[PDB]
Design a protein around this motif. Structure first.
Motif, PDB file in Angstrom:
ATOM      1  N   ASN A 188      12.408 -21.856 -45.524  1.00 20.61           N
ATOM      2  CA  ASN A 188      13.280 -22.358 -44.843  1.00 20.61           C
ATOM      3  C   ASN A 188      12.959 -23.815 -44.366  1.00 20.61           C
ATOM      4  OD1 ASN A 188      13.291 -23.292 -41.635  1.00 20.61           O
ATOM      5  ND2 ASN A 188      12.566 -21.183 -41.293  1.00 20.61           N
TER       6      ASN A 188
ATOM      7  N   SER B 169      10.493 -26.165 -41.451  1.00 17.70           N
ATOM      8  CA  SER B 169       8.999 -25.365 -41.561  1.00 17.70           C
ATOM      9  C   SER B 169       8.331 -26.183 -42.110  1.00 17.70           C
ATOM     10  CB  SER B 169       8.307 -23.987 -42.515  1.00 17.70           C
ATOM     11  OG  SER B 169       6.937 -24.035 -43.054  1.00 17.70           O
TER      12      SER B 169
ATOM     13  N   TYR C 279       5.258 -25.806 -42.865  1.00 17.82           N
ATOM     14  CA  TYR C 279       3.990 -25.990 -44.489  1.00 17.82           C
ATOM     15  C   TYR C 279       4.527 -25.382 -45.722  1.00 17.82           C
ATOM     16  CZ  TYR C 279      -0.171 -24.937 -40.532  1.00 17.82           C
ATOM     17  OH  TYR C 279      -0.709 -24.986 -40.079  1.00 17.82           O
ATOM     18  N   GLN C 280       6.392 -25.354 -45.026  1.00 23.71           N
ATOM     19  CA  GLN C 280       6.406 -25.183 -46.931  1.00 23.71           C
ATOM     20  C   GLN C 280       6.959 -26.437 -47.163  1.00 23.71           C
ATOM     21  OE1 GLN C 280       9.607 -21.892 -46.524  1.00 23.71           O
ATOM     22  NE2 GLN C 280       8.894 -21.012 -44.526  1.00 23.71           N
TER      23      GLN C 280
ATOM     24  N   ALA D 177       5.314 -19.282 -41.016  1.00 24.99           N
ATOM     25  CA  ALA D 177       6.312 -19.711 -41.388  1.00 24.99           C
ATOM     26  C   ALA D 177       7.910 -20.263 -40.980  1.00 24.99           C
ATOM     27  CB  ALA D 177       6.790 -18.573 -42.487  1.00 24.99           C
ATOM     28  N   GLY D 178       7.872 -20.267 -39.517  1.00 25.13           N
ATOM     29  CA  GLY D 178       9.052 -21.089 -38.698  1.00 25.13           C
ATOM     30  C   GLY D 178       9.116 -22.239 -38.728  1.00 25.13           C
ATOM     31  N   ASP D 179      10.431 -23.172 -37.669  1.00 26.78           N
ATOM     32  CA  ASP D 179      10.291 -24.229 -37.017  1.00 26.78           C
ATOM     33  C   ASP D 179       8.720 -24.306 -36.035  1.00 26.78           C
ATOM     34  OD1 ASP D 179      10.652 -26.491 -36.385  1.00 26.78           O
ATOM     35  OD2 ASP D 179      13.302 -26.280 -35.717  1.00 26.78           O
TER      36      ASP D 179
END
Ligand SMILES: Nc1ncnc2c1ncn2[C@@H]1O[C@H](COP(=O)(O)OP(=O)(O)OC[C@H]2O[C@@H]([n+]3cccc(C(=O)O)c3)[C@H](O)[C@@H]2O)[C@@H](O)[C@H]1O
Ligand SMILES: Nc1ncnc2c1ncn2[C@@H]1O[C@H](COP(=O)(O)O)[C@@H](O)[C@H]1O
Lengths: 649, 340, 339
Positions: free
Chosen positions: C2, C5, C7-8, C314-316
């Motif tokens: 993603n 994100s 976090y990513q 995990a998302g925006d």
């Protein structure tokens, strides 16, 4: 004793020097070093710190590994040592020196014809524009000795240079990058005793690097309760890939004492008087600093102490130091605005908690039209506003025994009233068979009334006496203005109060009417010196409360700050007709009175003190906070100190 | 050969616990009261004079301890005493706030015949109830090395023993106030290491029941440690801003009271007794488990530094300041005899 | 992956929280703490730091030694722990806790229904307006475990909380004064691995103190190549002798990411995205940082590492960070003029 000697008052004069670099030419660099050292000598300096690799040039790279260069460095270093026999200051000079297998990036500490020690840099950056590990060995963990011109001198990261006649001056030396790692050599040395931390730096200049130097040298000086003396290389280093700004600076417990011009043309020095007693006083009080040492005892006990006799000049050599006239009132307008904002929010937020906790009682206050009670009424209003309480829940009282008082009250829209205490006073004076008592009967009845109204009306009485009045015992004890349910001015010195009112006016959120009344209070009130000028008493108070300095030291500092109205800066709001200068005789006079009143007479009045928030980093005088002291002590020793050590004029 | 009427020649050491007139915040005045009492202890042929905690400054002065003029006055006054001691017989144990390294220590200065023998810092600094000591002063526990006093480096630390080279039974250890109250006091390791005479400089504001506490701990100390225990508290002159002071002084020997002075006196008071170093020696000779305890704590007990001095006591008849009962097996005290 | 994100991309979202103090009343402070933590959860924060002695109030002096107070603190602490079972962030909450002979001034690190560890303040100021050694014991040198609601959890100044799914997030916790001594616990912890240094503070406000806080939290974060997350006490502390400004702040390698209003009315949070990769990249390059660790190897090797699984969203969730268009050209005119 020589009262005008800075050395006799615990000052040490320190110099950070940036010299003319001639890369690859040690005799030329030594010649620039010797010329600057002669200047530092003429100034009476005790210490002169030069930049990293002074004798070779820092930027020469693989040229460092060339025998002729290494050889020239040694010859030049030994010439300096010989010249130093006639120089007052300890010289800290950089040099690439061979030891065991490699060359070390070292600082050579030189004094009166001898090398006291040789300190190697511990951490050698080898990243970005730095390539130090290529030519030089890390000094961390090296001990022992090194041979320099036929003598074995101490070598290593564990060295302290202590002046045997100046106990407050204990030097540790580190190099450049040493100061930038999470656990720097200099922090263990401070714990171990070092009061003055020197740093020899190369430090090619980049955008933003000067700010980094400052952040780290400054935080080091504040965390380590020390002077930090810092010199970077300037003109003459190679510009093959880098540029150099020659920055020098001297920090003391978080404050800048001196800095020199960046990117100068020609050589530059910072020179300042470091106050060793100030450092001594802060370490005396901050117990967790010693706890930290004890927790790292094996680290901190291992240092070797190299002793030397400085023998400083005994005469008047002036004082290279900014002594502000108002410890509590910064001369810098941006700074003073910051302090006012903080002072005021302290006073208010403190009262707001008391109010919330008492479920929002009415606020009872005696308004006389004076600075104190005026400012207090302003504080109280803002507190009630912030808490969403009607301003009519403030009960202001005129208690004659001015118009500004009733006007302010009317302008703010608080509940105003007058109560004439004269008949009650007459009755009391008659009943007593009746000067201090006459004054005191009135002051008492004021408080007595407010208290009873507070009981009657479900309110609390707001005290308004200020920090300078607490200090001096200038108040009426118990039944009298000393007493209240909550004191909002207890932590603010008299010198600051007027600037807080100014600040409230200038901000202007009370509106233009209030503004004009407050301005009138100001104009009226700046136009009780049985206790002396408050400017001098607030001065002494700071020195005593923060540092516990002896009286002769306090007189020296005050005289340097106050003796000439032309010199140094005045805060905002001092028209020229009100820029007094004081003689030594006058300072001396008011100081005798200060120690007598502060240490002997007044404590009992502080001992039973109402609640109120501490305000100044200078401290407060709450017996539950910053000042624990006996109510029954004499001041003889302070008085005797002044007698023996401060000249009559 | 010998002088049969000399107490010193029969293994006695004459000891004095003194409570002087405190003038808070005034070292030269306290020193003058100290010198007067020390001259008396001298005239009595005493070998040791112990004073109260923080003698030279006053114990109760709080943040005033941190004031340069006060610290400065203390040093000056201490050095004057040292000079006067050149003509005094007894070792003087005097309290003083002294600067060392970063902080001030609450210390006992051991002074003899014109020199400082040693400087001992209090180890445990009460900071609870009516006590606030950690605020002004540093813990001395684990400090060693030296301290500079009037141009000389003298032993500094909690590991000092002061041994008379001509009176082998007289080995002095010094601790301070609270030191005696913790589960494992300095003075118990010092006894194991050799100390026969344990001194305690005390401030000890008086409370209901405290005098009984002092006694229980000074007495059980002297019994468990097979030693003399010499104790002086502060009296008149200490601040009464929050506390009162009784000036109690006492001297204990292996569990027995040799001397105590008047609580709440008017004017200065001394306890003076003859300590029987042979009695202490004979008990230690026989109680093997005392020496086994030292062996079990050998690293603790071997690390003490021994500072030697020559006392040179008076050789003649100076009486015997000690209650010798006619009937060791028959106590003169009726309540005691009934018990027996 | 993603792409939107945070976090990513190696960001960790961090919160310094100043809650409403009710002195002497743990269940009330806990309730304020729970409300802010639920907010910090909704924001997808990974960490929420509160002020020193959160659960009792910092300013209560000898009341700290009252059994009913100590008991109330424990009950309140255990309720939080239970509530945390449904909260995303690691909570760092202050509490006077009993251990062995005394009470310690501690930070309790709480996560998803467990206490990960308990950290005692190391240096207790007993000068000027501070009286801490009177009520509380120094935690420097304490190791081992402490028993908290039937469980033995790590106790001491040597603890590191490492996210098993976010290698760049290693937390160390110190308290107030700890950051002001010449050799602070957090400096050793950074050498040992900590990337995010938390500080719970009480810190009665005085003229000039806010500048001192900044100088020390900032230099810390620069010298230690770390994020430094700082929370001071505000409204509700006693004003018997002091006042309180509720200041909170987050620093990253010398730069300010976020600060909150001084002297606020009501609770306040600073929330920022910390760039763990930026920290990682600077440590990668500054060799002398690792040399410093090696030189203090016995100090730095002794840390205990407590692992936990964060499991971030995990998302925006946006990006709580000021990213300048021109890394080489500061938007601030006074700054650009300097450059
Ligand atoms: N150590 C001690 N412990 C306990 N009590 C002590 C004491 N020393 C004196 N006392 C007693 O306390 C009393 C003396 O103190 P106190 O009654 O307060 O009165 P005192 O300080 O003698 O006089 C008050 C002075 O302050 C001035 N004043 C008054 C009111 C307001 C302001 C202002 O500028 O805002 C100035 C006024 O001009 C006057 O000269 C006497 O009863 C004395 O016996
Ligand atoms: N004439 C007055 N009218 C109203 N209040 C007064 C008056 N004089 C004194 N006070 C109150 O008493 C405080 C201190 O008294 P003082 O400094 O002795 O004049 C003032 O700040 C007022 O709160």
């Amino acid at each position: 004793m020589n009262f005008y000697s800075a050395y006799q008052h615990g000052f040490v004069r320190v110099a950070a020097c940036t010299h003319h670099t001639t890369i690859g030419d040690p005799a030329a660099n030594a010649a620039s070093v010797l010329d600057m050292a002669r200047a530092c000598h003429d100034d009476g300096a005790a210490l002169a710190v030069f930049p990293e690799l002074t004798l070779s040039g820092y930027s020469i790279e693989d040229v460092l590994l060339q025998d002729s260069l290494l050889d020239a460095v040694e010859d030049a270093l030994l010439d300096l040592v010989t010249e130093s026999a006639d120089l007052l200051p300890v010289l800290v000079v950089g040099a690439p020196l061979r030891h065991r297998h490699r060359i070390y990036n070292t600082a050579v500490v030189i004094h009166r014809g001898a090398v006291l020690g040789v300190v190697p840099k511990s951490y050698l950056p080898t990243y970005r524009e730095f390539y130090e590990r290529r030519q030089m060995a890390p000094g961390d963990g090296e001990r022992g000795t090194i041979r320099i011109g036929g003598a074995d001198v101490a070598f290593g990261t564990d060295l302290l240079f202590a002046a045997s006649d100046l106990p407050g001056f204990v030097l540790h030396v580190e190099i450049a990058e040493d100061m930038f790692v999470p656990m720097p050599p200099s922090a263990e040395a401070a714990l171990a005793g070092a009061t003055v931390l020197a740093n020899l730096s190369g430090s090619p200049i980049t955008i933003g690097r000067a700010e980094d130097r400052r952040l780290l040298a400054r935080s080091a000086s504040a965390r380590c309760l020390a002077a930090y003396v810092y010199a970077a290389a300037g003109e003459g280093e190679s510009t093959t890939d880098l540029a150099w700004d020659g920055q020098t600076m001297i920090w003391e417990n978080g404050a800048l004492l001196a800095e020199s011009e960046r990117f100068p043309k020609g050589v530059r020095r910072s020179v300042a008087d470091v106050d060793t007693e100030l450092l001594r006083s802060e370490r005396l009080r901050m117990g967790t600093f010693d706890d930290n040492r004890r927790h790292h005892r094996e680290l901190t006990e291992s240092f070797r102490r190299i002793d030397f006799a400085l023998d400083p000049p005994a005469g008047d050599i002036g004082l290279l130091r900014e002594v502000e006239r108002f410890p509590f009132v910064p001369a810098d307008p941006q700074r003073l605005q910051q302090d006012c904002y903080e002072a005021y929010n302290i006073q208010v937020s403190g009262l707001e908690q008391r109010l919330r906790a008492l479920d929002y009682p009415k606020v009872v206050i005696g308004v006389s039209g004076g600075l104190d009670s005026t400012h207090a009424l302003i504080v109280a209003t803002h507190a009630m506003d912030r808490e969403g309480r009607p301003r009519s829940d403030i009960l202001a009282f005129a208690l004659p025994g001015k118009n500004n008082a009733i006007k302010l009250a009317r302008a703010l829209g608080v509940t105003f009233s007058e109560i004439d205490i004269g008949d009650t006073a007459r009755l009391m004076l008659h009943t007593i068979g009746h000067d201090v008592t006459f004054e005191n009967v009135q002051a008492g009845l004021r408080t007595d009334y407010l208290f009873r109204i507070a009981n009657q009306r479900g309110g609390i009485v707001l005290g308004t006496g200020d920090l300078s009045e607490l200090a001096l015992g200038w108040s009426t004890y118990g039944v009298g203005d000393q007493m209240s349910h909550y004191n909002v001015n207890a932590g603010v010195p008299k010198t600051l109060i007027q600037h807080l009112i100014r600040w409230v006016i200038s901000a202007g959120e009370f509106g233009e009417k209030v503004g004009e009344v407050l301005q009138s209070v100001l104009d009226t009130e700046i136009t009780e010196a049985k206790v002396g000028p408050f400017a001098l008493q607030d001065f002494s108070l700071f020195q005593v409360l923060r540092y516990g300095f002896r009286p002769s030291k306090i007189a020296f500092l005050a005289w340097h700050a106050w003796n000439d109205a032309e010199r140094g800066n005045w805060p905002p709001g001092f028209p020229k007709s009100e820029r007094p200068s004081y003689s030594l005789a006058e300072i001396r006079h008011w100081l005798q009175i200060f120690v007598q009143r502060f240490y002997s007479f007044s404590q009992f009045k502080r001992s039973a003190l109402p609640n109120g928030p501490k305000v100044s980093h200078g401290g407060a005088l709450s017996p539950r906070g910053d000042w624990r002291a006996p109510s029954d002590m004499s001041a003889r020793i302070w008085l005797d100190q002044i007698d023996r050590e401060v000249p009559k004029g | 050969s010998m002088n049969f009427y000399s107490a010193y020649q029969h293994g006695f050491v004459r000891v004095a616990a003194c409570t002087h007139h405190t003038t808070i915040g005034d070292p030269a005045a306290n020193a003058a009261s100290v010198l007067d009492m020390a001259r008396a202890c001298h005239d009595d042929g005493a070998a040791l004079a112990v004073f109260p905690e923080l003698t030279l400054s006053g114990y109760s002065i709080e943040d005033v301890l941190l004031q340069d003029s006060l610290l400065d006055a203390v040093e000056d006054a201490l050095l004057d005493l040292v000079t006067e001691s050149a003509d005094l017989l007894p070792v003087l144990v005097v309290g003083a706030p002294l600067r060392h390294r970063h902080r001030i220590y609450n210390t006992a200065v051991v002074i003899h015949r014109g020199a400082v023998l040693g400087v001992v810092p209090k180890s445990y600094l009460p900071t609870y109830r009516e006590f606030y000591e950690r605020r002004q002063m540093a813990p001395g526990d684990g400090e060693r090395g030296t301290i500079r006093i009037g141009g000389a480096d003298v032993a500094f630390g909690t590991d000092l023993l002061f041994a008379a080279s001509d009176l082998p039974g007289f080995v002095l250890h010094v601790e301070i106030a609270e030191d005696m109250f913790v589960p494992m006091p300095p003075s118990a390791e010092a006894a194991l290491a050799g100390a026969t005479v344990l001194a305690n400089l005390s401030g000890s504001p008086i409370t209901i029941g405290r005098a009984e506490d002092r006694r229980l701990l000074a007495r059980s100390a002297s019994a468990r440690c097979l030693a003399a225990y010499v104790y002086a508290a502060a009296g008149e002159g200490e601040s009464t801003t929050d506390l009162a002071w009784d000036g109690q002084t006492m001297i204990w020997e292996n569990g027995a009271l040799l001397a105590e002075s008047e609580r709440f006196p008017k004017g200065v008071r001394r306890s003076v007794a003859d300590v029987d170093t042979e009695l202490l020696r004979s008990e230690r000779l026989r109680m093997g488990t005392f020496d086994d305890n030292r062996r079990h704590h050998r690293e603790l007990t071997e690390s003490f530094r021994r500072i030697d001095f020559a006392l040179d006591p008076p050789a003649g008849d100076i009486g015997l300041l000690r209650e010798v009962e006619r009937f060791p097996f028959v106590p003169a005290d009726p309540q005691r005899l009934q018990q027996d």
